Design a protein around this ligand. Sequence first.
Ligand SMILES: C[C@@H]1COC[C@@H](C)N1c1cc(=O)n2c(n1)N(Cc1ccc(Cl)s1)[C@H](C(F)(F)F)CC2
Length: 544
Amino acid sequence: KPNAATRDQLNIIVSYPPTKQLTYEEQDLVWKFRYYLTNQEKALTKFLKCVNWDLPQEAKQALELLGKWKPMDVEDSLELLSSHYTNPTVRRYAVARLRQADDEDLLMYLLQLVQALKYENFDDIKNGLEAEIDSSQIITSPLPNLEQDLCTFLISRACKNSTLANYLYWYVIVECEDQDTQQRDPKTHEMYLNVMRRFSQALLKGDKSVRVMRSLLAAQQTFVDRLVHLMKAVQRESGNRKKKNERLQALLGDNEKMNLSDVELIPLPLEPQVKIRGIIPETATLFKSALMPAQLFFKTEDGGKYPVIFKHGDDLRQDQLILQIISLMDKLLRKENLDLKLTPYKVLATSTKHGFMQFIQSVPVAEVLDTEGSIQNFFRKYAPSENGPNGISAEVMDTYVKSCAGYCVITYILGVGDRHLDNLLLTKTGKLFHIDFGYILGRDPKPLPPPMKLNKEMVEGMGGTQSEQYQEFRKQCYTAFLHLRRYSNLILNLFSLMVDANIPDIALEPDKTVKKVQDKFRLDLSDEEAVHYMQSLIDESVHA
Ligand SMILES: C[C@@H]1COC[C@@H](C)N1c1cc(=O)n2c(n1)N(Cc1ccc(Cl)s1)[C@H](C(F)(F)F)CC2
């Protein structure tokens, strides 16, 4: 039991980011008052970071306390599923606490949970079963407290929830198709195939509904396979954009050949809650871009049109991670009652070579300026209001201020590079948002880029630096920033699980990736120092 002075020193340690490396001096203090810290749920993660698991007595002593401790939070168990831990009892404990989460929260961490399998017992996975095997053909070729591992648990929940089933499927499918993994880590590629085999197996074993989930996934797999075959053809067609589009619509029209315009209701892999009847052949076109991506309009169950960007010949995993993080950041912000009107549009890689994107009706800021002159002109044209600020609907102005603040902070934390008016989009409802996340975590095609993604034209849109709207922008920025800092351990743990994913800007320096995010939070500052720090970044970016 420690004195009043020691307790403060322990508290400094317990409050540390999950990433920060514990000094020997710190390691010994935690090791000493380990029976004291038992009632501190947040200290358990700092305790298991002291232990040298290579030492049986130290490992054994550590596990006794793990049973005695105040049960860990769901957000903190993600720490135990990283590469830092190899102890089966620890990894089993993470899963045991992770089971406390509901499916909504699980989906939030699913991309990372799939990556965490890379640190699981590959043999234990293989035992669960009852180049040679093609992963894409597993589901399409059906054959006539601390007990569960990560693999068992995910599969278990995936069989009860169709939304999880879908993302579990496509996440694991993309891991299986990873060439770098096949080449450099064959035993990992072999694990993912076995995860996919265990999944197909568990679904086949299920009730009427679970057996249909498997056919649905096969239908989805088959549909994607045909859309790829159509894409390869369109990308190959000799001619101009008009020639390739006519080929695109011709093949989409040919339902007997291609089977893409009229299909039995199947969930959209991108967003499974949306079921689709097929693709409208006549509204399909390629974007001007040299990668030849297509704009395809899906026919939904209840009469809607769901536009997608389907890319073939590009890896969508970086963009996929960023949009799932923006979606998480938006969810925590909303949780803290701060809806900043963000566009966390869906992105799903259906392979390392292709994937889907949720298309949002929007206009690039560049176009807005080159057609209407200003953001305020655009807004007066589509949302005029006499009583409103600068002749614009207050709702639209409120949406504009909120989304600008939200994206300023989010793109600041994620170190989003290559920012230009062509990859900043506006909606007639006042929604501002970012697209194309090719450069993140401090990368940029140009050297020494600004830490904040602001400009003259963005502020002009609010009514300039002297407006009431400009004050509210600053207020929203530093409010959003304080909130996101409150979930720094959750964000940092999720990024901790992304180090061994083949995401270009993470692959570049895995060992230094999480510190890049950690440093943006400026956890060294108090919330008041943080609020002033955020104002300095905003002011400097605007004045420059
Ligand atoms: C899916 C999202 C959200 O909804 C709107 C849309 C902008 N979007 C994105 C995201 C994204 O990464 N890109 C694109 N559109 N277009 C860029 C543009 C497409 C349409 C424009 Cl207008 S500007 C091209 C691509 F063709 F290669 F994909 C370059 C990359």
